[PDB]
Write a protein that binds this ligand. Structure first.
Ligand SMILES: [Mg+2]
Lengths: 76, 76
């Protein structure tokens, strides 16, 4: 447990003016948000790869269940 | 096989060959993965904006607590 120590999200949401934070505090915020950005980017790459494989497999079947634009825009 | 109530992640991990799935099953997978990719892309945009604001605020101070490369790579 955190023992009520503030999370990066809570510090960020509760700060009216960043000028009131120290550089050490700002660097902690930036580090936390940067880590989340990197985790998201890794997961986006996984999702894009799976979508690419699925879309190629649907196209491979040479059917007409879905139109070209439904495939391109993922209108399912 | 039928009415197994599997999640998209479970279907994906448990399918050795996508030719075993119906087009309707592939549609559902594509839709779930596309929705997830859009959801975390939105969150990524938020994280990138917060990082941009924090980095500008540290630069604004005109100090030397952090080097240029430390700021550029978020090394903390
Ligand atoms: Mg900037």
């Amino acid at each position: 447990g955190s023992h009520m120590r503030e999370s990066a999200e809570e510090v960020w949401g509760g700060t009216e003016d960043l000028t009131s934070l120290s550089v050490e505090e700002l660097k902690g915020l930036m580090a936390r948000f940067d880590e989340e950005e990197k985790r998201i980017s890794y997961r986006r790459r996984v999702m894009q790869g799976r979508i690419d494989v699925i879309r190629a497999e649907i196209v491979r079947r040479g059917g007409a269940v879905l139109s070209p634009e439904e495939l391109a825009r993922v209108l399912m």
